[PDB]
Amino acid sequence: TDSFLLRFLRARDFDLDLAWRLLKNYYKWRAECPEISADLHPRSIIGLLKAGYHGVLRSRDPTGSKVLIYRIAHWDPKVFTAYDVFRVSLITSELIVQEVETQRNGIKAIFDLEGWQFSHAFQITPSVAKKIAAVLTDSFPLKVRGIHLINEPVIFHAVFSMIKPFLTEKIKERIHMHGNNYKQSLLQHFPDILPLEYGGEEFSMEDICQEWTNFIMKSEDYLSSISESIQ
Amino acid sequence: TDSFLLRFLRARDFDLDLAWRLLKNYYKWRAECPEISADLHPRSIIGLLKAGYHGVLRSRDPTGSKVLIYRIAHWDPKVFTAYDVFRVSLITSELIVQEVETQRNGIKAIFDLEGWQFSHAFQITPSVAKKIAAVLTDSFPLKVRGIHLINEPVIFHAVFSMIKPFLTEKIKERIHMHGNNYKQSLLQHFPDILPLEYGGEEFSMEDICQEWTNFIMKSEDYLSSISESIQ
Amino acid sequence: TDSFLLRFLRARDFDLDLAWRLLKNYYKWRAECPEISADLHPRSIIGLLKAGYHGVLRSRDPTGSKVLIYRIAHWDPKVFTAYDVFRVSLITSELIVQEVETQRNGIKAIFDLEGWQFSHAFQITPSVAKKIAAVLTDSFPLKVRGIHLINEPVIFHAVFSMIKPFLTEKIKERIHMHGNNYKQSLLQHFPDILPLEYGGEEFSMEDICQEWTNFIMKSEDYLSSISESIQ
Amino acid sequence: TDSFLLRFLRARDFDLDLAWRLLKNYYKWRAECPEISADLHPRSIIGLLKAGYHGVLRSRDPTGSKVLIYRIAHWDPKVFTAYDVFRVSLITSELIVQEVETQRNGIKAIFDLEGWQFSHAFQITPSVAKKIAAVLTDSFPLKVRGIHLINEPVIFHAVFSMIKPFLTEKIKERIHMHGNNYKQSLLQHFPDILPLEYGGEEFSMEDICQEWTNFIMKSEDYLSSISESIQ
Ligand SMILES: Cc1c(C)c2c(c(C)c1O)CC[C@@](C)(CCC[C@H](C)CCC[C@H](C)CCCC(C)C)O2
Ligand SMILES: Cc1c(C)c2c(c(C)c1O)CC[C@@](C)(CCC[C@H](C)CCC[C@H](C)CCCC(C)C)O2
Ligand SMILES: Cc1c(C)c2c(c(C)c1O)CC[C@@](C)(CCC[C@H](C)CCC[C@H](C)CCCC(C)C)O2
Ligand SMILES: Cc1c(C)c2c(c(C)c1O)CC[C@@](C)(CCC[C@H](C)CCC[C@H](C)CCCC(C)C)O2
Ligand SMILES: [Cl-]
Ligand SMILES: [Cl-]
Ligand SMILES: [Cl-]
Ligand SMILES: [Cl-]
Ligand SMILES: [Cl-]
Ligand SMILES: [Cl-]
Ligand SMILES: [Cl-]
Ligand SMILES: [Cl-]
């Protein structure tokens, strides 16, 4: 039985001081006003999952990182708030951090920003921006080994400019923007494992999303106990 | 179920600051270049165990300390490196630290240096010397209550002189050198519990080594999980 | 008979202080833990040479620099480690530094990074990165007048980002990245002397590699004496 | 052809600064008033050699150090001065430093002080004492890995007390005093290689001295060229 504090050690290469600072932030970061709740039950965001907003690839990248996929077009800003969408990432992260190999090799996330609207940007306030930067850098026990943005419209750079100043130099080096002709570049970073929609060979995004939705629903009892352990 | 961090508390008389510093070193000490691996499976050093290099007494000393015995003559430096020999002590220590009474009363080690050669000393580099001093003082959650050297040849003092400068005043007070006429002195420190070869009454070293070898092999599954919890 | 210390003078335009600092680093740089051995015998890396990984052009560039060619596709990371590959450059450098005209006009290296894999990047640790930067700047008596990277995949920039912070401003100005359409740009820097595979007119890479392999094997006695003069 | 400055590098583990300081002292140390001459021709001390004062063992110690033997009883202070006796060590040192394996593994010297008289001590002035300490520590490119004194009379400690304050902590750790029952202790440091007179099995001191005397006489042309290269 790995202690709860072991994931923080692995996240900081067993540097006790650094892991301590990470744990401190992990308990404080969401309490930043206006706070996001510690509620991690999928009932409030099951609609997002069924809309096909989010999924996790079955296979890891060539360095062992778990690969996450987000499709912004499947987020209706009139139905779900940024906090709801944020909650989806929290739920997923709390689940995949259980894997030791994820703890060691980190994660990489792919954001399909095709269909990004001003209504989306309206949700991203400075306070939200700060929280995004927090979990990317030093507030959650997951190594962010790479962030890949594809199909980014020109209007998105305003949003990213809100997040940028709160980002460390390390994470900034790991943020990639591919544009519309992403497939060649994206395939080089993720051989053999991408879905059909992004240059892959086997699985479709619909299947990948449905699989991860089932896993989240399946884990709703574990997600409840996590919620009660941070309040 | 005692938490993993309780053995560090007991090792420092429940001084939270001091136990914290010990845990920090416990995760860092082996990473000192050139590093020793976190691998604790007995497969790589089963030869040493079967050669009769190492054993643990069945009974404790009058103060409750576990008593460890090392015979340097049973270490062939042409077959096993200093790192392999070091690994044997790591494996044994990770096992006996599970006993609460060992956590409270510490350990005492007896090194039979009869048969110490220059080929042995060749293995003990300055880096190795530093690591020896580290686990003796502040890098492993075991109180070193005594170190007893017997049958030490005159050429050994060069080796000890490498270790000495990195030793604290407390541990230095606890290092004894008996020479060839050790039996009278050694019996006073360890009544009733020594093997036949060292003035004892009952058990032989061959039996003691065979018993501890079986226990190590028996614990190979626990030793694997420890290895995976420090990387 | 040119003294051994003359190549360090020529490398620093007969600035005695600067040449002294270079000689100091030349003796210390490989001892950085984890150290690379001073062994320069081609027996350990003959496989790399026969695989066509490395060769030296017969003719010099328009400024008199010796031109070196490396093909990363001919390096199998499952057979040869980064240290083995590093050793190949050490061996070549120790040979060409014997030429006075190379001492005066320096060298230029061309790295064909076509076929660069994550398995290659796995070998390039931070410690290795530091050593690469060391021999590029101030640890070997060869003026690096230019480094040319061709056919670089997008995933390589992560590796280069490890090396970059340890690079001086001078050397950084001398690192070129051409991409896939390199031929026009590469021909302007190296007229008349390139192999067929890179826009040249006469010789093939296979011939160039075979010629330099023979020369290395031919010089194995000189390479042994160098090894014994740095330990 | 190893440069003359390579022996200073090997003597200081290729630390360029430290080797530089050693070379500086090597040229200055004998010039300390009252100076000893740079003359290294055996003609002035052939009498000492034929008297059986000095010899070098054919075999090295278990660590590769050259082993030197001095017999103070064969020094007649009424015939040869301390400077003459000092010259013998200079001559021997300049010869054995030519061996690369001696440069790497250093030397160990055995002084048989049986027959030490006050007439001997009369020769050892404070200035002489300082010079003895100089060549032991930082004025000659030979690592002193050990000094062994045997058969030392009680009156010798006055002489050693003159040398002691000018000795570094490192060298002081390497000075052994065995007394009259030296054989057991001396054999442990030098197995298989000692002469008959000191617990050995094969060769006698008379043979060892005669062999080294021939070698010195044989090298008189090399010793002349060394003398002319330090003035
Ligand atoms: C532990 C962890 C969390 C919790 C996490 C992410 C990652 C990589 C993590 O490791 C990435 C996404 C994020 C920050 C949730 C983002 C919430 C907003 C609403 C997403 C849509 C708008 C973003 C402007 C789109 C770009 C996001 C990238 C700049 C990361 O939640
Ligand atoms: C937690 C712990 C470890 C890990 C440990 C020891 C003790 C008492 C511990 O509590 C004692 C032995 C040691 C340091 C391994 C020593 C490895 C070398 C190769 C032993 C042979 C050579 C030594 C020069 C012999 C003398 C050793 C004493 C000076 C300790 O490993
Ligand atoms: C004196 C000298 C040495 C010794 C040398 C080089 C040069 C130009 C020298 O002048 C260039 C190559 C290098 C640094 C060996 C590199 C070893 C690694 C394994 C090469 C493959 C991976 C590299 C990441 C590829 C890019 C290299 C460039 C950034 C230089 O060895
Ligand atoms: C490079 C080198 C030299 C040059 C050298 C020695 C050694 C080990 C060297 O490595 C040892 C002997 C010495 C210092 C010459 C000594 C001269 C006197 C006259 C010897 C007789 C009286 C001594 C009081 C006897 C004890 C000597 C030990 C304390 C070294 O010359
Ligand atoms: Cl909320
Ligand atoms: Cl990219
Ligand atoms: Cl190892
Ligand atoms: Cl005692
Ligand atoms: Cl190596
Ligand atoms: Cl260019
Ligand atoms: Cl004189
Ligand atoms: Cl002794």
Residue numbers in the entry:
A (entry chain A), B (entry chain A), C (entry chain A), D (entry chain A): 48 to 278
Show passages lifted from the paper.
Retention of α-Tol in animals requires α-tocopherol transfer protein (α-TTP) in the liver, a cytosolic transporter of 32 kDa weight. α-TTP belongs to the Sec-14 like family, a protein group involved in secretion and lipid transfer. α-TTP recognises and selectively extracts α-Tol from the endosomal fraction of the hepatocytes allowing for its transfer into the inner leaflet of the plasma membrane and eventually across the plasma membrane into the blood-stream. Here we show that, upon binding to α-Tol, α-TTP is formed acquiring tendency to aggregation into high molecular weight oligomers. X-ray diffraction reveals a spheroidal nanoparticle formed by 24 α-TTP protomers of ≈17 nm diameter. We verify that such particles are efficiently and selectively transported through a model endothelium tissue from human umbilical vein, with a 28-fold increased flux with respect to paracellular flux.
